[PDB]
Structure 1
Amino acid sequence: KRESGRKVQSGNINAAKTIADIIRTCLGPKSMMKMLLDPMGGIVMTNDGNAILREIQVQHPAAKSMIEISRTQDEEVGDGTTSVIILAGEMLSVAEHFLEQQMHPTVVISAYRKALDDMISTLKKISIPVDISDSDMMLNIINSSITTKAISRWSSLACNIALDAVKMVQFEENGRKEIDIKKYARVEKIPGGIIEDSCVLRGVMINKDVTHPRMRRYIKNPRIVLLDSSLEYKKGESQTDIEITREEDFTRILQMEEEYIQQLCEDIIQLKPDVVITEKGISDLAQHYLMRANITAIRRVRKTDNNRIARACGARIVSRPEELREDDVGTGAGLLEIKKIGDEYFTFITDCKDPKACTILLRGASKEILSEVERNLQDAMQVCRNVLLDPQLVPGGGASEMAVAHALTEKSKAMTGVEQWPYRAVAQALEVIPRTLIQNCGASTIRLLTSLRAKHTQENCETWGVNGETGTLVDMKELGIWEPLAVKLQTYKTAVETAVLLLRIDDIVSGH
């Protein structure tokens, strides 16, 4: 139940090596498939490295750390997540200098963290500046992710979707230029149509349906009223219910409920609005007064959605409906539309401004095509996110892993001390990324990797990668396998952070 000594350090090596050996052959566009058996007898043959290790149950607690850290890796970037776990396994696989040479882990940690700043500065040396204003240069960078998919026939449309989505969310006036896909880039699906009919809405779309037919259908000048409190009778400080037993008491509670409901509606119609968007729900008696004034009733929206609507038309979020002013006019908007497109109502309040947000309109003939375009366009917006955050590109395909590992061999000659032996172990562990690309293509591994290292010691290190498709060597300046710097830096930082985490572990202790 509890382990101590050197069996935990050698046990954490085999716990992480058995995770990297699962997805060792799952690298590159020529990746192989796996067979996942279900207890109900079914088999899923997915090739996503995030989907393979999620459903696999593990018993070692050190192998549990490989999944939950990589689960946070999917939230940061959406590319190269299986390359982290291979680098996490190969950095911990050289157990000769770990335990067989009787070295303390603090010796290996002081050499691994001294390899981190050499792995960072070398990746910034081989970079290339990016002209972000040109759209034809940003078309070839999404081709590394849109390939082998169903969106390859509409690559020009999917490039126009992801480029216009990342440019509207980027608020560069603060200096830091934050990008928020989960908040300001809410993707919605519209049933019906074809993949070519998909576009980007310039604003916020609300999926609230229409209950009463007496609502505004097409208004050129809408007026949006944003509210927080609900439109019902005012309750007390507690949630107690008002029960009525006597017949005379039924008239007293109903007249104060009718007066409070019609008062919260009459101060909205003094501005003559077109659509009422409130945070909480709407009662049935308030809907009778909302359909009397012939206006749209929208409820159940988030607080993040209310911030983007107020910046779209110039509205202001008011908590109570009895405190509205003249500033809460939604003028300047494009048009109002609640047209049911594909058996689903959609609230169109788009305009011609940039309120630090956007809306992606997904079209498809069925739900199977709508589920394909959603997961493919989400990877397209995450690639262009790292470009606008820092316009620097690193050539992938094993060229970056051989440019850094060549610099670690030259820097190891002038690095004296006992830490020079695991310092060369980081350079040989970085060669596993072009090693499996030869194994996945089918060529000879040791015959081609040796000539790959001979090309790096003489010529330029930014060139001469490995083509995973044809199997032979190709120049990275000719074919577009250019990967972002923010993805390769976050990969190399996390691979060291999980190598410094499992090597610090000496005892396993159970208890609360």
Structure 2
Amino acid sequence: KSRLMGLEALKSHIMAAKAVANTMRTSLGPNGLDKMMVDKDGDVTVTNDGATILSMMDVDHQIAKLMVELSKSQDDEIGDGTTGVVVLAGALLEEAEQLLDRGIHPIRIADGYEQAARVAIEHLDKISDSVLVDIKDTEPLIQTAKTTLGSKVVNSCHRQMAEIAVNAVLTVADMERRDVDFELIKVEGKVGGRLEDTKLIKGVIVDKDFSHPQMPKKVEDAKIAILTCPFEPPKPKTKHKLDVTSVEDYKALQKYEKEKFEEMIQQIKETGANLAICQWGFDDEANHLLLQNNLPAVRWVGGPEIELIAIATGGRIVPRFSELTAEKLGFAGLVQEISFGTTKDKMLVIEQCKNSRAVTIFIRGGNKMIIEEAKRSLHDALCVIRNLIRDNRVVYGGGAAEISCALAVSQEADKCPTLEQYAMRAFADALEVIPMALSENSGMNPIQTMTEVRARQVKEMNPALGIDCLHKGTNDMKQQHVIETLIGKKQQISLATQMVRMILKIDDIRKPG
């Protein structure tokens, strides 16, 4: 095993980084084709995600492992945009290896990139807008939803799910001192109806998964009850079976279970209790025996789900079975069964709560890819509305921000002592790769369009000119209602700079050669 001494290790690392970034450079923008994936079996899927593809990627290099780890560790603050950072890092590494061939230490360019990103952020902070009120975030809601979703899962537009997701965040933002929590909103998915049947569960929705739909089940309840005492023969987290060395104990146990059913129903009839849910359960035979006669009740409520049952009512619990009354329980409002299919199982939706801590959305589908794309669009909308309510500052998209930043960097760094121009210009000229790739992904020439938009931006003012991927009329940005958050761009730039610095810093020798 020989040791890589000299400049071959850096060249191999840059080559591997470029080969890795070439995969993400092809799929860029909404006009990108679908990328396929397959495991060891016969499961072949197709999708377009910067995180799902990088997750199931097999590489044989520690640099690629560190790159994918840094890319996966930063994805909760930007949402959508984990593909351009790799291309930017690859272009920066290419510029670094091109400038290093003349005999320049990587420390100089690594330190220059810091102030380059700093002045780029400083210039981007002054080119934005801050005139958003209670109308600028409510009237263009349909336009923002159309720009976020697009036309990938459904050709037509969708206004119900967008308004539902907006209200689900508006009912929690201003209520908890302009703050929102990720654990408060949940995403649920189940096949059934169509995509337009979007429901907003104000309370909590719980499924039961029945066994026989032909069994008679009549709804007739009006008050919920929570208990901790063993309402029925419990299961102490142990798979019970025929562990009795007798022949007459089965009938005795059945008679005892029937007597327990009779006693329990007589107590809930003499005290006023109805659907009492505990923290224990039994087999399906006991449930069938209880549902055969009168009073419908289904067990099997084991697990941490009882926690939500301790929060969707309003009160406390009882430590002993011999401590029950008409005031220690909890009153309800409308607790019944809901089943839109009328052929499957039932669901319970709590419509009585003093706070909003489990608001969720319910979207029906018909396959596996459409529901996944719908949930991805919903997550992206939630992320963008969180970024909007966190800071009322946005910026225009397309490809004008990078050109403006490069122009400002050049205009402010034309003066240099001995090293304030090389690294800064290598960071500036490598910023025009995203619009060039976006224009090349379509059916137009990227060089000519980029030169034309640069001339148009340098001739007159109003830096709001870019390219169009949908083939429309003019190349304006304020007319297509396209917008992009600035905090996400700042985070992406910071992550790219940190990754470039970490790559340019660790480059000495390697132990396993």
Residues 420 and 473 of structure 1, relative CA distance in 2, 3 Å threshold? farther
Instruction: Decide whether aligned partners of structure 1 residues 248 and 365 sit closer, same or farther in structure 2, where only a CA change above 3 A counts.
Output: closer
Partner of 2:389: 388
From 208, 217, 220, the equivalent of 2:219 is 217
CA distance in 2, matches of 1:400, 1:69: 25
CA distance in 2, matches of 1:506, 1:260: 74
* Cα distance, 1:497 vs structure 2: 2.2
Q: 1:363 to 1:412 in 2, by over 3 A?
A: same
* Residue deviations 1:139-190 (CA, integer Å, cap 9, x gap): 111212322323342421232232123334x35455461331x653232324
Identity of aligned residues (%): 31
Quote the Cα distance in structure 2 between the aligned partners of 1:391 and 1:362. 29
Shift of residue 397, structure 1, vs aligned partner: 0.8
Contact residue 128 and residue 394 of structure 1 kept, 8 A: yes
1:127/1:392 contact within 8 Å kept: yes
Q: For 1:392 and 1:279, locate their aligned partners in 2 and report how far apart those are by CA, in whole Å.
A: 48
**Structure 2 length-normalised TM:** 0.80
Q: What's the counterpart of residue 145 of structure 1?
A: 148
**Alignment correspondent of 1:504:** 505
How far, CA to CA, are the matches of 1:194 and 1:211 in structure 2? Answer: 25
Contact 1:6 1:506 in 2 (8 A): no
* Matched letter for residue 155 of structure 1: H
Deviation at 1:89, TM superposition (A): 1.4
1: distance between equivalents of 2:38 and 2:239? Answer: 50
Task: State the shift of 1:233 in Å.
Answer: 5.4
Bigger shift: 63-72 or 270-279?
270-279
Counterpart position of 2:12? 11
Cα distance in 2 for partners of 1:74, 1:378 equals 12
Deviations 1:215-255 (A, max 9, x none): 77354x4425276999755969x999997669999999999
**For residues 402 and 351 of structure 1, what CA distance do their matches in structure 2 show?**
53
Taking the aligned partners of 1:417 and 1:279, their CA distance within structure 2 comes to: 74
Listed one character per residue, the Cα deviations across residues 288-317 of structure 1 (whole Å, up to 9, x for unaligned) are: 8976764454524546x835x555443457
Partner of 1:124, secondary structure, is helix
Assess if the C-alpha contact under 8 Å between 1:215 and 1:295 holds in 2: no
What displacement does 1:135 show?
A: 3.4
1:161–1:200 Cα contact (<8 Å) kept: yes
**Matched letter for residue 142 of structure 1:** A
Contiguous gaps of at least 5 residues in structure 2: none
Please state if 1:196 is matched with 2:188.
Answer: no
Q: Determine if the alignment matches structure 1 residue 428 to structure 2 residue 455.
A: no
Which residue type is aligned with residue 482 of structure 1? I
- Give the superposed CA RMSD: 4.4
Larger mean CA deviation between 144-153 and 266-275 belongs to 266-275
Question: Is the Cα contact below 8 Å between 1:408 and 1:427 reproduced in 2?
Answer: yes
The 1:115–1:229 alpha-carbon spacing in structure 2 relative to 1, beyond 3 Å, is farther
Give the equivalent residue in structure 1 for 2:471: 470
Tell me the amino acid that sits aligned with residue 440 of structure 1: N
- Counterparts of 2:466 and 2:227, CA distance in 1: 55
CA distance 1:505–1:284, change in 2 (3 Å): same
Distance 1:405 1:190, change over 3 A: same
Indicate conservation of the 8 Å contact 1:142/1:380, yes or no: yes
Please say which of residues 226-235 and 71-80 is displaced more in the overlay. Answer: 226-235
1:64 Cα deviation (Å)?
A: 2.1
Judge which range, 338-347 or 402-411, deviates more: 338-347
Distance 1:250 1:195, change over 3 A: closer
Q: Which residue of 2 aligns with 1:404?
A: 405
How far apart, in 2, do the equivalents of 1:241 and 1:86 lie?
60
Q: Using the alignment, how far apart are the partners of 2:307 and 2:446 within structure 1?
A: 56
In structure 1, the residue matched to 2:487 is 486
Alignment correspondent of 1:299: 301
SS in 2 for 1:27: coil
Counterpart Cα distance in 2 of 1:228 and 1:441? 66
Q: Where does 1:31-180 land on structure 2 (aligned, <5 Å)?
A: 31-33=32-34, 46-96=47-97, 99-129=100-130, 130-131=132-133, 134-168=137-171, 170-172=172-174, 174-175=176-177, 177-180=179-182
**Partner Cα separation in structure 2 for residue 215 and residue 510 of structure 1:** 70
Give the SS at the match of 2:363.
strand
- Give the distance between the partners of 2:35 and 2:239, measured in 1 at CA: 54
Task: Summarize the Cα distance change of 1:257–1:397 in structure 2 as closer, same or farther, 3 Å threshold.
Answer: same
Give CA-to-partner distance per residue, 1:288-347, whole Å, 9 cap, x none. 8976764454524546x835x55544345789878889565152x443215363654342
* Aligned residue number for residue 377 of structure 1: 378
Pairwise mapping of residues 318-397 of structure 1 onto structure 2 (< 5 A)? 326=327, 329=330, 331=332, 333-339=333-339, 341=341, 343-351=343-351, 355-366=356-367, 369-397=370-398
Please list every run of 5 or more consecutive structure 1 residues that lacks an aligned counterpart in the other structure.
Answer: none
Structure 1 residues 394 and 47: alpha-carbon distance in aligned structure 2, compared to 1, 3 A threshold:
same
Residue 413 (structure 2) pairs with residue 440 (structure 1): no
* Change in CA separation of 1:293 and 1:463 when aligned onto 2, cut-off 3 Å: same
Matched residues in 1 for 2:316 and 2:4: separation?
60
> Which of the two has higher C-alpha Rg?
2
CA gap 1:352/1:120 in 2 versus in 1, 3 angstroms: farther
Question: Could you report, residue by residue, the CA deviation over 1:343-371 in whole angstroms, capped at 9, with x for unpaired residues?
Answer: 54342324276513322122234556544
Q: 1:480 to 1:347 in 2, by over 3 A?
A: same
The alpha-carbon deviation at position 138 of structure 1 amounts to 1.6
Shift of 1:417: 5.1
TM-score by length of 1: 0.80
For residues 480 and 314 of structure 1, the distance between their equivalents in structure 2, rounded to whole angstroms, comes to 46
Preserved CA contact (<8 Å) 1:403 1:461: no
Q: Deviations over 1:103-145 (max 9, x none)?
A: 3333223222223332333333223343456533121112123
Distance 2:281 2:52 in 1: 37
Evaluate the alpha carbon distance shift between residue 256 and residue 32 of structure 1 in structure 2; reply closer, same or farther with a 3 A threshold.
Answer: closer
- Distance verdict in 2 for CA 1:43–1:409, change over 3 Å: same
2:168 is matched by which residue type in structure 1?
Answer: A
